[PDB]
Amino acid sequence: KPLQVYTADNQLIAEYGGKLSIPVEYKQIPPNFIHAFLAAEDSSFFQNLSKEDILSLYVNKIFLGKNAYGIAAAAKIYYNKSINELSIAQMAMIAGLPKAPSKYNPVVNPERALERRNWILGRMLQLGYISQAEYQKAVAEPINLNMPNRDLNNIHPYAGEMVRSELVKHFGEQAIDSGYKVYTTINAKRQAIAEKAVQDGLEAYDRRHGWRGAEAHDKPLSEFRAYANTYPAQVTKVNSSSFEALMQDGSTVTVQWSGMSWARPYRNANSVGAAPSRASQIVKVKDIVRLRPNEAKTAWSLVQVPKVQGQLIAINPNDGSIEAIVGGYNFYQSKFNRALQGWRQPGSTIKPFLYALALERGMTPYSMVNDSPITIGKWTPKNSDGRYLGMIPLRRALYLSRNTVSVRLLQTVGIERTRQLFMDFGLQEDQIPRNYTIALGTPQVLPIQMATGYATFANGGYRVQPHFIQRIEDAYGKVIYEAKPEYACIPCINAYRQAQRILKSSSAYDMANILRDVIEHGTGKIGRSDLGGKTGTTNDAKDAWFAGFNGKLVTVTWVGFDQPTTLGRREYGGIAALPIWINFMGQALQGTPAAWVRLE
Amino acid sequence: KPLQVYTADNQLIAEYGGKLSIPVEYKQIPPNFIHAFLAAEDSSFFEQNLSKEDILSLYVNKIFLGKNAYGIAAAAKIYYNKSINELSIAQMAMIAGLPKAPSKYNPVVNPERALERRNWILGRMLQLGYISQAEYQKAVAEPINLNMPNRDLNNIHPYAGEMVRSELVKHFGEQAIDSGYKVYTTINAKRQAIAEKAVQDGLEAYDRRHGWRGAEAHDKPLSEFRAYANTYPAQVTKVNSSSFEALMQDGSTVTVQWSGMSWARPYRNANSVGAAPSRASQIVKVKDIVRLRPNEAKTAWSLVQVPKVQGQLIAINPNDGSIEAIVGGYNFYQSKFNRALQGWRQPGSTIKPFLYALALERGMTPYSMVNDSPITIGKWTPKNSDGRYLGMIPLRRALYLSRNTVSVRLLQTVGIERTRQLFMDFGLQEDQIPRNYTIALGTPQVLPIQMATGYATFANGGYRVQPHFIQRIEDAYGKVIYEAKPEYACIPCINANSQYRQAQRILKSSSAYDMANILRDVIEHGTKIGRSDLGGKTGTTNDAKDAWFAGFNGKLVTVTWVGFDQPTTLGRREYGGIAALPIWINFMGQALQGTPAAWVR
Ligand SMILES: *C(=O)[C@@H](NC(=O)Cc1ccccc1)[C@@H]1N[C@@H](C(=O)O)C(C)(C)S1
Ligand SMILES: *C(=O)[C@@H](NC(=O)Cc1ccccc1)[C@@H]1N[C@@H](C(=O)O)C(C)(C)S1
């Protein structure tokens, strides 16, 4: 009975197998398996004939490492076999595990596992349990593990992992042995769109910065996995216009010129080399490259897995329901979820919160703010273009993300009030400094916290908590948990708990319209008039961000390197992150009526 | 509901607690405990959390919290011997930090990391307004304060209880304990208590004759020493002419008079002891950690000494192989090692009755004339105890005097391998039996339990029995789930796929009966106990590195052994009949008291 993960459309996406036990009748056990356990210890005092009687009591319960309880569960976990399918060597291997299922574990210690196994086989031969023909056959055998994957998460991997990883973080492994059915808030349609959007957008950035060379050279093809419609290939021959590579299935294909001609060499973030003139300039024989098919087959392409990363988090602003979550380029490349764990500087994406607080103090989008050099704090922050503009309205200041006005508004608003709003988005006391650096978006945030923060505009100034579980049922079918979220607007549940108000209705509604002005009048791609959004770029374009919404959906996208480096000069939030956001929102919001903030 | 260990005479001797879970109603949980789990993680996605509080109720009694603890109540019991409402804020925070990795943060395994995690949580609890700063300073300054109760109770017959736990765990792992079963052993409690006293007195006898070896420590702390085998650590505070004064672990100061320490002839070596002490300063120094023994009144104290020497006793029923008594060393609290089941030693002349039984097999009798003459085996001429020879002598005289030359001659007569096969058929390990003429003088390594199995062959009429310690196992519901089906030497004897297994015959009835009587005459001629149904053989290895005695009656086989764990000489006077035999006599006399004569048939 495994932990089962479903989407909001009651569709099964993941099964997570915990503690396994397959009880067998003593008669169903091959004698050689019993013999293996009898030879496992030198001395029995319960020859070993009374151990055979007491063995029946423990045979289905013995912990045999890696969630295996009993002989059948160990035959399944280690070899993907039934007890009668096991070899003498395999039976002896399992027979050696009870004493210490970690010091002898063939996964965690293959060295000692073989030593123990063969000792048992040696003892079985001495006891006349096995013949020498069986002894030589068995002792010469390798470990031969064929471990089936009991953690099935192949449909929406980041969504299934989110459930497993979060339950384990808060409650340990016992959370997976409960056999519960977890019914998530995830929209599968929206989840699929987000997965494609993050993959395409990162492939877009990667392609424009050029070919970086093969992912490895003189390394073994067995050590690389296929994913995101990219398949590892070992280059075998390089010609005038085409190369030949060996696939993991054993086949060899011929990647033609049109499939590699894009490979202008990467020189730096801001520089790429001339278009390649021959295939030798792109690949070397014994290079580990990634290839891509077409629809069915026909032709192949030389592709590249981005070194760059990204994320997407989409939440319902009224309750905080998580609709879509993508933690990186691909789950197989990295199981790391940047949406829930990727601490980054928000840069300019923080400004709408600070400018909302200015509006709360009495200001308007038209209020005159001053873009001037700020020496104050014996630290002089400089604007993006190293320029100043003088007196400009609050709305202009936000749109151009004038760093000097932000520090001035932070001095006006007070560092305390700013930190209070931030904590209301899920932030900890320890992750927001007191200093005037918070006006510039330098403190580390998780994108989920940004989606929570932007939801404040979308919902009219209420504090919603992001949540991924709608209900949990026990294996039987009984509902044991039913989500009771804090609602921004309780009447709105037509197309119990009330969320506390964190920002004044007018300020949340005003910021919303400034953000809509920012997207409709600044930048320029969708046929919607209910969208508000803000771009963000940190110092030396170390992060590209876009936080945007409509009345029914908040989406935050991010693009950057895991080890912080520049994305390039001409690489801002609106260039790297925005195209993923547009591509998601357009598709996710397709055939849905206009929904905007309610000034109540 | 722990693994319970009983004797054959129905005494509960040990309780072994495995996986623990004490389910509690969510309402019964102190809010500070819930708050601790709330502050344990930075972000929850299932200031306030709320979502976690609802999902916590589902796992609160099942969360694995390390060291067999499942749920908050089990962790409160295991780590602190407290109920959840008795926990401090610091303790609640400690348990709250364990779910994520109950080993990387375990306070019993990794205390440093555990302290860092706990305080981080307390810090987090203060930030959220869960705890006040007064509670924060109070809690953060607290130590680990572990008060782990002992869930493995075994203080009646410790070697017997440990035998069950250690053997189930060896063969079946920890899951063998969390089963809640009732194990009904073959152990006789009366006999077990006698054996415990016998092994303790006999080793104290050897130790005392060998002299005082000095205090167990000097200038060290009295808190670091345990009391056991009726010996209590004392720190010497004053040394008078004829007496000394020592501080006890309870805080009292006792006076040890001259008669209490006068035995303390100083130990020089196994073969040498110093002159009788003339004054108390020659025995003790002020600040010496000594061991004392009271009388029954606690009105007189004695200076005693824990033997450096070891011993064992194993008593089994020869008809089925039931283990009646087992003592693995001087005391379980000095060493948890069981020398009866794990102590591999050379048997010495304790092996000759096996070899002489095979001589009888082929056709010989106790009266058959054998040759005590000088025997050359390659570049090794074995010499008898006294180096002398006796010429033609009957087989029984040869065994009694343990004439090494007749043994090698009998080994040549029966054949090296045909003997190895028989030694194995007696219960000795194939790999542990060499392929040479020295197996005649007991060179192999044996377990005493194997010797008791082998001697039971004489006692039972030539059958091979297997030693067993479990009579039956019942589940928690009272249902018998296991019932021992041993191989019986004599099935009719109990009434004084099959229901009753008949043990395999390994000797002709005549040769087992003949060896038995040879062994009885070995014992009657130069033993003490008022019994005529006892047969036995002494054993001494080269340089008295081992003193042995293997003896029986029709109902009980007892094997005793005396020696050092790191093989050294016991001394020159120290043969099997001197060191081991007195423990055997002392046990057998008391164990067989008020029982009719029982001999082989
Ligand atoms: C907030 O993100 C702003 N960042 C900065 O002013 C610092 C900076 C920006 C680019 C390179 C080096 C340093 C603004 N981010 C973008 C944006 O909002 O899209 C601008 C390019 C307008 S600056
Ligand atoms: C068997 O134990 C025999 N021992 C030896 O040959 C070696 C030895 C060791 C110490 C002293 C003398 C000889 C013989 N049988 C034992 C016995 O049965 O007790 C003797 C010590 C008599 S010698």
DSSP string, A242-264: -EEEEETTS-EEEE-GGGTTT-P
Surface of B (342-371) touching A: CB under 8 A:
none
- Both structure tokens of B562: 């005396």
Architecture label for domain B1-18+151-211+307-601: 3-Layer(aba) Sandwich (3.40)
| E runs forming strands in A32-99 | none
Q: How was this structure determined?
A: X-ray
CATH topology assigned to domain A1-18+150-210+306-600? Beta-lactamase (3.40.710)
Tell me the C-alpha distance between B238 and B285, whole Å.
Answer: 8
Q: Which of B312, B343, B345, B344 is nearest to B330 (CA)?
A: B312
Catalytic residue, chosen from B179, B322, B349, B511, is B349
**Of residues B284, B290, B278, B305, the one with CA closest to residue B239:** B284
Comparing alpha-carbon positions, the chain B residue that sits nearest to A429 is: B127
Residue B247 tokens, joined:
């501080």
Judged by DSSP in three states, B418 sits in: helix
C-alpha distances (whole Å) from A553 to each of A454, B190, B374 are 10, 79, 105
Inspect the interface and report whether the beta carbons of B46 and A469 lie closer than 8 Å: yes
Q: Which two structure tokens, joined as six digits, stand for A355?
A: 């400018």
User: Cα-flanking dihedrals φ and ψ of residue A206, to 5°?
Assistant: -55, -55
Give the SS3 label for residue A404: helix
Residue A577: name the closest of A317, A347, A360, A261 by CA: A347
> Ramachandran region of residue A550, left (φ > 0), alpha (ψ -120 to 50) or beta?
beta
Residue B38: closest CA among B25, B16, B56: B56
C-alpha separations of A281 from A208, A261, A288, A508, B106 in Å: 18, 11, 15, 55, 56
Ligand 1 centroid from CA A569, angstroms: 11
Of A196, A183, A181, A184, the C-alpha closest to A466 is: A184
Which tokens go with B338?
């069981």
- Identity of the amino acid at B518: I
Q: Would you call A374 helix, strand, or coil by DSSP?
A: coil
Report, in angstroms and rounded to the nearest whole number, the Rg of chain A calculated over CA atoms. 30
User: What end-to-end distance do the CA atoms of chain A give, in Å?
Assistant: 48
A243 inside 8 A of chain B by CB: no
User: How many Å apart are CA B110 and CA A491, to the nearest integer?
Assistant: 52
Q: Which of A157, A201, A192, A189 is nearest to A545 (CA)?
A: A201
For residue B37, the chain A residues in CB contact (below 8 A) are 170
Beta bridge partners of B293: B302
Residue B278: exposed, middle, or buried by beta-carbon count in 10 A (0-12, 13-18, 19+)?
exposed
Residues B576/B547, Cβ–Cβ less than 8 Å: yes
State residue A598 phi and psi, 5-degree precision.
-105, 110
Strands laid side by side in the B3-6 sheet: B152-154, B12-16, B3-6, B182-185, B470-474, B480-483
Q: List the one residue out of A13, A7, A1, A576 whose CA is nearest residue A331.
A: A13
Rounded Cα distance, B461 and B475, in Å: 37
Residues with CB under 6 A from ligand 2: B 348-349, 385, 402, 404, 538-540, 542, 544, 575-577
Q: Which helix (H) or strand (E) holds A4?
A: strand A3-6
According to DSSP H, which parts of A80-149 are helical? 88-95, 110-126, 132-139
Ligand nearest to the CA of B540: 2
Residues of chain B neighbouring A51 (CB-CB closer than 8 A): 171
What is the C-alpha separation between A63 and B18, in angstroms, rounded? 14
Nearest CA among A227, A240, A252, A305 for reference residue A276: A240
**Which residues contact residue B477 at a Cβ distance below 8 angstroms, ignoring those fewer than 6 apart?**
none
The reply to whether residue B172 touches residue A62, judged by beta carbons under 8 angstroms, is yes
User: Nominal resolution in Å?
Assistant: 2.6
DSSP count for chain A of H helices, then E strands? 17, 21
Strand pairing of A479-482 and A301-303? Answer: unpaired
List phi, psi (to 5°) of A345. -80, 125
- The 10 Å CB-count burial string (b at 16+, else e) for A468-503 is bbbebbeeeeeeebebebbbbbeebeeeeeebeebb
- Furthest-apart CA pair in chain B: how many Å? 101
CATH assignment of B212-306, among 2.20.28.120, 2.40.50.140, 3.30.565.10, 3.40.50.720: 2.40.50.140
Q: Of all atoms in ligand 1, which is nearest to the CA of residue A574? A: 19
Give, in order, the Cα–Cα distances in Å from B466 to each of A22, A54, B38, B451, B540.
33, 15, 58, 12, 26
Give the position of tokens 């010129």: A257
Element (H, E) at B14: strand B12-16
CA B407 from chain center: how many Å? 33
Q: Three-state secondary structure along A425-474?
A: CCCCHHHCCCCCCCCCCCCCECHHHHHHHHHHHHHCCECCCCECEEEEEC
Q: Which residue has the tokens 């063998």?
A: B176
Q: CA-to-CA distance for B549 and B519, rounded, in angstroms?
A: 11
Nearest to B41 by CA among B98, B121, B107, B118: B121
Nearest Cβ partner of A175 from B59, B431, B482? B59
Q: Does A469 touch chain B (CB under 8 A)?
A: yes
- Please spell the DSSP secondary structure of A252-308, one letter per residue: EEEE-GGGTTT-PBEEETTEEPPPPSSGGGT--TTEEEEEE--SSSS--EEE---SS
Catalytic residue among B15, B41, B135, B245: B41
Of the listed ligands, the closest to the CA of A402 is 1
Distance B543 CA to ligand 2 centre (A): 9
Contact check, Cβ <8 Å, B468/A46:
yes
Q: How many CB atoms lie within 10 A of CB A103?
A: 12
Strands (E), B368-503: 369-372, 391-394, 463-464, 470-474, 480-483, 487-488, 501-502
* Token pair of B259 as six digits: 């008669």
Cβ(B512)–Cβ(B458) under 8 Å? yes
Closest CA to B395 of B502, B521, B480: B521
Q: Residue B363 gets which letter from DSSP?
A: T
Measured by CA distance, the residue closest to atom 13 of ligand 1 is A539
Query: Which tokens in the block code for residue A317?
Result: 């602003």
In angstroms, rounded to a whole number, what is the distance separating the alpha carbons of residues A328 and A559? 9
Is residue A111 part of the annotated active site? The answer reads: no
> Could you tell me which chain A residue has the CA closest to the CA of B65?
A172
By most ligand atoms within 8 Å of CB, the mutation choice from A353, A450, A537 for ligand 1 is A537
- What is the 8-class DSSP label of residue B444? S
Q: Which helix (H) or strand (E) segment is B140 a member of?
A: helix B133-140
Does A99 sit within 8 Å of B170, measured CB to CB?
yes
Phi first, then psi, for residue B479 (nearest 5°) are: -80, 125
Q: Which residues contact B21 (CB under 8 A, 6 or more apart)?
A: B61, B62, B70, B71, B73, B74
List Cβ neighbours of A68 (8 Å cut-off, separation of 6 or more).
A20, A74, A76, A77, A78
Nearest Cα to Cα of residue B32 among B107, B121, B105: B121
- Do the strands B288-293 and B232-239 form a parallel or antiparallel pair, or are they unpaired? antiparallel
The two tokens of residue A183 are: 């019914």
Q: Does A26 touch chain B (CB under 8 A)?
A: no
Compute the 3-state secondary structure of chain B and give helix, strand, coil in percent, each to the nearest 5: 35, 20, 45
DSSP letter, residue A321: B
Q: Are B274 and B266 in contact (CB under 8 A)?
A: yes
Q: Which ligand is nearest to the CA of A574?
A: 1
The secondary structure of residue B73, as a DSSP letter, is H
Closest CA relative to residue A466, chosen from A453, A477, A480: A453
Q: How far apart are CA A416 and CA A438, in angstroms?
A: 11
Other beta carbons less than 10 A from residue B422's beta carbon: 19
Please tell me if residue B166 touches chain A, with a CB cutoff of 8 Å. no
Question: Which residue CA neighbors atom 5 of ligand 1 most closely?
Answer: A384
What is the torsional sign of CA B378, B384, B386, B389?
A: negative
Instruction: Give dist(CA A596, CA B4) in Å, integer.
Output: 69
For residue A582, give the amino acid letter. I
Chain B hits for A41, CB-CB cut-off 8 Å, are 170-171
Nearest alpha carbon to residue B140 among B127, B155, B123, B158: B123
Sign of CA dihedral A81, A84, A87, A88: positive
For B584, the 3-state DSSP assignment is helix
The values of phi and psi at residue A12, to 5°, are -80, 120
Q: Chain B closest CA to A83's CA: distance in Å?
A: 18
Q: Domains of chain B: which residue ranges?
A: 1-18+151-211+307-601, 19-150, 212-306
Distance CA A454, CA A441 (A): 15
Closest-CA residue to B31 (of B106, B85, B67, B79) = B85
Q: What is the CA radius of gyration of chain B?
A: 30
Cβ of A401 closer than 6 Å to ligand 1, yes or no, is yes
- Is B41 an annotated catalytic residue? yes
Please calculate the CA angle B330-B336-B341 and round it to the nearest 5 degrees: 85
Distance, CA of B464 to CA of B468 (rounded, Å): 13
DSSP type of residue B265: P
Measuring CA to CA, which residue among A531, A485, A511 is closest to residue A421? A511
Q: CA of B112: how far to CAs of A325, A539, B105, B143, in Å? A: 37, 39, 9, 11
Cβ neighbours of A350 (radius 10 Å)? 27
Evaluate whether A314 touches A546 at the Cβ level (below 8 Å).
Answer: no
What are B275-282's contacts with CB under 8 Å, separation 24+? B277/B212, B279/B241, B279/B242, B280/B239, B280/B240, B280/B241, B280/B242, B280/B243, B280/B244, B281/B239
Interface contact flag, B449 A486, Cβ < 8 Å: no
| CA–CA distance, A93 with B40 (Å, rounded to integer) | 40
What's the CA gap between A341 and A355, in Å, rounded? 27
Helix, strand, or coil here: B125?
helix
Query: Residue B120: which residues within 8 A CB-CB, separation 6 or more?
Result: B97
CB neighbours of B293 closer than 8 A, spacing ≥ 6?
B230, B231, B232, B301, B302, B304
Q: Of A27, A46, A120, which to mutate for an interface test with B (greatest number of B Cβ within 10 Å)?
A: A46
> Quick check: A295 contacting B, CB < 8 Å?
no
* Contact in structure between B512 and B462 (CB atoms under 8 Å): yes
From the list B51, B100, B179, which residue is nearest A467 (CB)?
A: B51
Quick one: residue B240, left, alpha or beta (phi over 0 = left, psi -120 to 50 = alpha)? Answer: beta
Q: Which architecture characterizes domain A211-305 according to CATH?
A: Beta Barrel (2.40)
